[PDB]
Amino acid sequence: GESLDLRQRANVALHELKAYLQAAFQAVDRAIAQKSSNEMAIFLSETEATLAAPTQTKLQSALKKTIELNCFMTVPLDDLIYLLRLCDSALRQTESLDFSVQTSWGAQDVEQWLELLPNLEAAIRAARTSMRIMCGGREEKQLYSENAIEQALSLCKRLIDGIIMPLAELRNTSDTEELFKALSSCKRRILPLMTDAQKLLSMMSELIAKVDTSETVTNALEFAASQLLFIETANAERDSVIETQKFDGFRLVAMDMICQIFLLNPSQRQGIIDEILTSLEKLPLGKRARTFKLADGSSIQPVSALIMRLVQTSAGIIQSEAQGASQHSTAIRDLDTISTPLLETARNNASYVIKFIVNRALNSPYRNLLDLFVEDFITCLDNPDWPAAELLLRLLMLMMVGLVENDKSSIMAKNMALELLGTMCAAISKLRGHVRKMASALEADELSLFLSDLAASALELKSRPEHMVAWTGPYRATLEYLQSRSNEDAQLSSAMTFIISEWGSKICTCYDGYQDDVLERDQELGRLAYRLREMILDRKWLSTEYTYKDVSPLQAKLSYSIILLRSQFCEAFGAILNILLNSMASDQPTVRSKSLKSINQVMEADPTILDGDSVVVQLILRSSSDSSTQVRDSALGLISKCISLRPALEEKMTETVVNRFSDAGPGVRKRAMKLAKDIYLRNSNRVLRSAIANGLLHRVQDPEESVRDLARQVIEEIWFAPSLSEHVILMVQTVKRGNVANVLDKVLQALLSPSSKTSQASMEVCRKLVGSMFDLIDNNDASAPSGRDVLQVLMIFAKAEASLFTFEQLRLLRPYIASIGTSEDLTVSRAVVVIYRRVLPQLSSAHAQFLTDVRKELLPVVAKVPRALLDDVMACLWIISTLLGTYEPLARLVISSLKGIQKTRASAQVQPLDQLKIRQFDRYSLIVGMAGKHCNLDSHHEMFKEHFPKFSGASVSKLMVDIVVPFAAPSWPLDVRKPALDCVGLVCQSSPRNYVAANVYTAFQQVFDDQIPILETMVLRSLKEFLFSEEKRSETNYDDVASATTHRFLKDITRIATSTQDDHAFLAVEVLASINRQGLVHPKETGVTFITLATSTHPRISELAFLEHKALHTKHETVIEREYAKAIQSIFAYQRDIVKDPRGATTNPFTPKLHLFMEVLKISKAKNRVKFLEKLVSQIDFDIAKLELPPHVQYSRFIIENLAFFEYVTVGEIHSLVAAMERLVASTGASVAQVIESEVRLRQLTAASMILLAIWEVRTYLRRLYSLARPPVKVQGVTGDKVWEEINNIMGALSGGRERMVRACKDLVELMSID
């Protein structure tokens, strides 16, 4: 009942302190008179006697009361000097005493140690009393003594070194077990000592702020506090002498002290930080653990907390709120002048930190401490208690962007900068996601609504500087929250002042950003200016002049996060994200994987960045087509993550996946098709699934083998595994989509062949698939597949395995056969006739009447249907006839056709035919030819003699040939010579013995002589079928036949193959490739031709010819090593006359014409390749006496432009090459240059020179392109455009302009300075 007005309270504190003081002094008197220690005093000698620690405590409390009530000035001076003297006695008592604990001590050393505690504690709290007396503002000199400060500082040092630290570090080890349990037995006596120490240290922190002190004192305090900062608190409260929280209290007191020293001495701030950051380096990692617990539950290492605290200590004309609303400009300017220096000092401190840690992260080990600092700052980024996190991270980010953006920066620095920009990017992404989450909640709360709308605006970059700095906005809420949680917490109050200054500065920026004059806005901003100014000048101004609602930690976190989204750090997101994305195509294998990791974290943290015009999607897709392999390989991973987070992207991204099926790398393809498999199972879209399956199937005929195995595997899983309608439909769509007929056939054959994985199990699934396809035809009104399209897949099924088909479902195709005669849809017709062709010979019951009827309905169509279908239907006829016992209908067809032919001849004897009889003959010869191709009626050698009396030989084949070939003569028109040669070709390909008859090869020789393309195609196709079947054979014996005709026509087929670059030539080389693979011709007659065709632009000629050259060299190197000159000359003549491009190399990507040649020479190895190069050089030598551009100059240019670029595989090859070029130039250039000096025909010696100048040009280009045995290496920037252009320049001399003709000879005389 003594809480009144401040006056009376002051008097009460005064009288209480006076009373207690007198009681203490007369307690000392009693303790001296009597030679014993009093309840309050301690007897030392018979003249001295000090105050005990508890009485010192109470005196301290009373003194604090007198100070806070501004009545400490009234305390009698004379009896304060006496108290200071008692303190000085208690301090002199223990000045030399050694109260330190030793780990070696035993259970009894602590008993002798425990007897010091009365005097020791009395001295500690005596020092505290002295300091507090020096913190009263009194002016008398007898109340201040440097020596008292010295004593207190000593006690602090010896307390930290001798008790606090060794007690914190002491564990329950067998070496120090006894001591541990001994001290643990007197906890209760240790604790008051610890409290005394804390109170003294904190009292020093207070001291240095109220009395000016030496720099040596504050340096010693900074060293001691720095030591207490890294105190080793125990893990759990089991192996610590006392409660760990007490030691935590020491850590906090130390942080407060360091912040105080840091604040009251600007000059050495950078020093403090600096040393604090190097002390952290000289410690075992065990201390670097995050042992500083935060209210929110997370943890940081204490050095991080201290650094940030130091960054936040920075904050450590109008006089009416109305005048500021009208003169808002002046209010803003005042606020600017007061607030900008605070944030300037904050940025200065933060920059001290960042500069230090980055500096010694690079110019040094220490990078791990930078990583730890960054991690802790990220942890505290969105914590309103720690606003310095965004500032440190902001400056760090600006610095890393800077390092990445200046090209004069090291690789270590760039790699570090990218690696950190990644983690920062991830942190920002997580913050944005968290803001969206918090703002999506439903809260019947005005503030929650305001924050929700404001967050909606802030996630997008919608400008709102005026709602952010609003009086009731996020800054207000954050500060009110920190206030409620705060009123002695130095850390929290520093955070508050810091945020207040940020608020003021943002007010100023908001007002200064607008160039209009919106009145009310400006007035409100002026009010905010005045308010925030008063707040910065006095922190208690906010809570004193206003009151506000209570803010929940959720509302506070959302508020501060909204503020962060508009900070310079978070606003950089986009920019730095790009830096990250573009760093996926990096060079190092660690910055790339790290970048990918950070991009994944960014995506998962806030998937909304994959929506709309998402740059992440864009640049991931661009990554999938990067010039590097594993960059695309990982780009597939990113694509997969995108699809995982937003499946809507799936449909538009699979197109990029299937494209990667045709990627160079054999691994990226495998990955892309595994991903495409997963997508196939996920997505039921028929267009996607069909495209996937089409690509996968296309990848069965892939170069690499493992990829083929994978293609098969997957196709077996997704198509042929135990929705059937969906399966069949997907198959129909897949085959209808593209060119996947033969391939799927070989998949089914590689799948259903016996002695395999699951043949008998995967057989009946195909049986029921086929049965379904027919079930889809037995019958509408649906988007089901077309019967035609179904028959296209049933066709290839019947080709693969006819066992799957049954007779009953061949009866469903029955009406398709009857309509073949006119039904224009030829696809369906060929399909059904092929299905009968393949299936029907597999039946066992032999349905006689069915076969007979089918033939009777299938023969008359022979007279109309086109050729391609006439083939399959004729085959079907032959089959039917073999299953049946009869062949007379076929023989009748052949005989009637032949009769018609010789009737055509008889008619031609009267009138020169007409446009109608020629077509009749076309059909006759076509029927005869196809019949000869499929059905050879040699067994019915008597059925034909009855109609052709002068027939004898039992050939029939020769009868057809003998009747038709007379019309292949040039005396007939082309419409007649064509189907005649076609007929005899179809006959011969299945009866090869007719080839070597004088009757036919005279017509073939005539064809090749006439050089008519179409009817020599008629011959080439026949020879192609014959030889190809002759390969299926080896891989009744027509070897000597094949060789006979092969040798007769080799020259002609070669001519056709090497005269043009169109498909016809491809047919010719397609015959020669077979001729060579079989071995009918010697490799000498073939090598140069294929070596030459390998340089063709038509891909189908180049690939096949390259295969034949590669295999031929593999088996017959001995012979090709001798035909190098003719091969080079041949390639040049081919490029000049056929391709019509006499250059020695292509334009982009700059590859030589002979790059295939040398590639084949990459298997021979040894110097055999070297000599080839040398031979090239030797082919450039010349003898004046030869001769526009001389032939040898065009050739020389052709084969030096090849030397420029070749992808040499050893430095010995290129070294011997440039050696041969220097040797040649120095040998012939002597004669040339010499006779030039004399004579200077002019064009003759210019021609001469150009060769040498070009040689030497390429020579220098090579010397600089590599180096002035073992594999070679290319130099960074030696593209090759300069050497190309310059070569052309040299090769333009003889097109002048006699001037340049002479400058060429001159440059040659000087290039090799002789005289």
Helical axes 302-312 vs 269-279, angle rounded to 10°? 170
Residue 43: phi and psi, rounded to 5, are: -90, 120
834: tokens are 């092929």
Hey, what amino acid is at 620? I
In the chain, where the domains are located: 6-242, 331-573, 887-994, 1184-1315
61: tokens are 């409390």
b/e sequence 763-797, b meaning 16+ C-beta within 10 Å: bebbebbbbbbbebbeeeeeeebebebbbbbbbbb
Peptide bond before residue 1229 is cis, with ω within 30 degrees of 0: no
Q: What whole-number distance in Å separates Cα of residue 3 and Cα of residue 291? A: 43
Q: Name the nearest CA neighbour of 765 among 801, 713, 811.
A: 801
870: tokens are 């006439």
In whole angstroms, what separates CA 762 from the centre of its chain?
40
312: tokens are 């936040």
Q: Name the nearest CA neighbour of 1065 among 979, 1144, 1134.
A: 1134
The helix or strand, by DSSP H or E, that contains position 50, with its residue range, turns out to be strand 49-51
Give yes or no for a contact between 710 and 673, defined as CB atoms under 8 angstroms apart: yes
What DSSP string describes 482-498? HHHH----HHHHHHHHH
For the chain, the residue count is: 1315
Give the number of C-alpha atoms closer than 13 A to the C-alpha of residue 349, restricted to the C-beta side: 29
Q: Name the nearest CA neighbour of 771 among 736, 816, 730, 804.
A: 804
CB-based burial of residue 940 (10 Å sphere; 0-12 exposed, 13-18 middle, 19+ buried)?
Answer: middle
Task: Return left, alpha or beta for 746; rule: phi > 0 is left, psi -120 to 50 is alpha, else beta.
Answer: alpha
184: tokens are 């643990």
SS3 719: coil
The DSSP code for 406 is -
What DSSP string describes 1235-1280? HHHHH--HHHHHHHHHHHHHHHHHHHHHHHHS---------TT--S
What DSSP string describes 1089-1150? HHHHHTT-SSHHHHHHHHHHHHHHHHH-HHHHTT-HHHHHHHHHHHHHHTS----SB-SSS-
Task: Return left, alpha or beta for 1146; rule: phi > 0 is left, psi -120 to 50 is alpha, else beta.
Answer: beta
In whole angstroms, what separates CA 556 from the centre of its chain?
38
Give yes or no for a contact between 66 and 134, defined as CB atoms under 8 angstroms apart: no
Look-up of token digits 């179904």: 790
In whole angstroms, what separates CA 416 from the centre of its chain?
18
Residue 104: phi and psi, rounded to 5, are: -65, -20
Give yes or no for a contact between 1092 and 1045, defined as CB atoms under 8 angstroms apart: no
- Strand partners of residue 41: 51
Give yes or no for a contact between 985 and 1018, defined as CB atoms under 8 angstroms apart: yes
The helix or strand, by DSSP H or E, that contains position 299, with its residue range, turns out to be strand 299-300
Q: What whole-number distance in Å separates Cα of residue 1209 and Cα of residue 942? A: 71
The DSSP code for 685 is -
Hey, what amino acid is at 195? T
What DSSP string describes 237-278? TTSSSS-HHHHHHHHHHHHHHHHHHHHS-GGGHHHHHHHHHH
Q: What whole-number distance in Å separates Cα of residue 331 and Cα of residue 319? A: 10
The DSSP code for 293 is E
Peptide bond before residue 1149 is cis, with ω within 30 degrees of 0: yes
Q: What whole-number distance in Å separates Cα of residue 676 and Cα of residue 658? A: 7
Look-up of token digits 């209908």: 889
951 C-beta neighbours (distance < 10 Å), count: 18
In whole angstroms, what separates CA 641 from the centre of its chain?
12
Hey, what amino acid is at 758? T
What DSSP string describes 1001-1039? HHHHHHHHHHT-HHHHHHHHHHHHHHHHHHHHHH----H
Give yes or no for a contact between 842 and 830, defined as CB atoms under 8 angstroms apart: no
Q: What whole-number distance in Å separates Cα of residue 1068 and Cα of residue 1078? A: 16
* Angle formed at CA 931 by CA 927 and CA 933, multiple of 5 degrees: 120
Find the radius of gyration of the CA atoms of the chain: 50
Checking 469-472 for CB contacts under 8 A at 24+ apart, the result is 469/503, 469/506, 469/507, 469/510, 469/525, 469/528, 471/524, 471/527, 471/528, 471/531, 472/447
What DSSP string describes 1166-1206? THHHHHHHHHHHHTT---SS-----HHHHHHHHHHHHHHS-
Task: Return left, alpha or beta for 297; rule: phi > 0 is left, psi -120 to 50 is alpha, else beta.
Answer: left
The DSSP code for 1152 is B
1248: tokens are 């001469």
Residue 41: phi and psi, rounded to 5, are: -105, 165
In whole angstroms, what separates CA 290 from the centre of its chain?
33
Q: Name the nearest CA neighbour of 1027 among 1059, 968, 1067.
A: 1067
Sign of the four-CA dihedral 48, 49, 51, 52? positive
Q: Which residues contact 626 (CB under 8 A, 6 or more apart)?
A: 584, 585, 632, 635
- Parallel/antiparallel/unpaired status of strands 49-51 and 41-43: antiparallel
Q: What whole-number distance in Å separates Cα of residue 712 and Cα of residue 391? A: 58
Three state DSSP letters for 969-1005: CCCCCHHHHHHHHHHHHHHHHHCHHHCCCHHHHHHHH
- Parallel/antiparallel/unpaired status of strands 299-300 and 49-51: unpaired
Q: What whole-number distance in Å separates Cα of residue 810 and Cα of residue 831? A: 12
b/e sequence 521-558, b meaning 16+ C-beta within 10 Å: ebbbbbbbbbbbbbbbeebebbbeeeebeebeeebbbb
Maximum Cα–Cα distance across the chain: 170
Q: What whole-number distance in Å separates Cα of residue 1172 and Cα of residue 1110? A: 16
The DSSP code for 163 is I
Provide the strand spans (E) within 858-908.
none
* Angle formed at CA 141 by CA 139 and CA 142, multiple of 5 degrees: 120
Task: Return left, alpha or beta for 1274; rule: phi > 0 is left, psi -120 to 50 is alpha, else beta.
Answer: beta
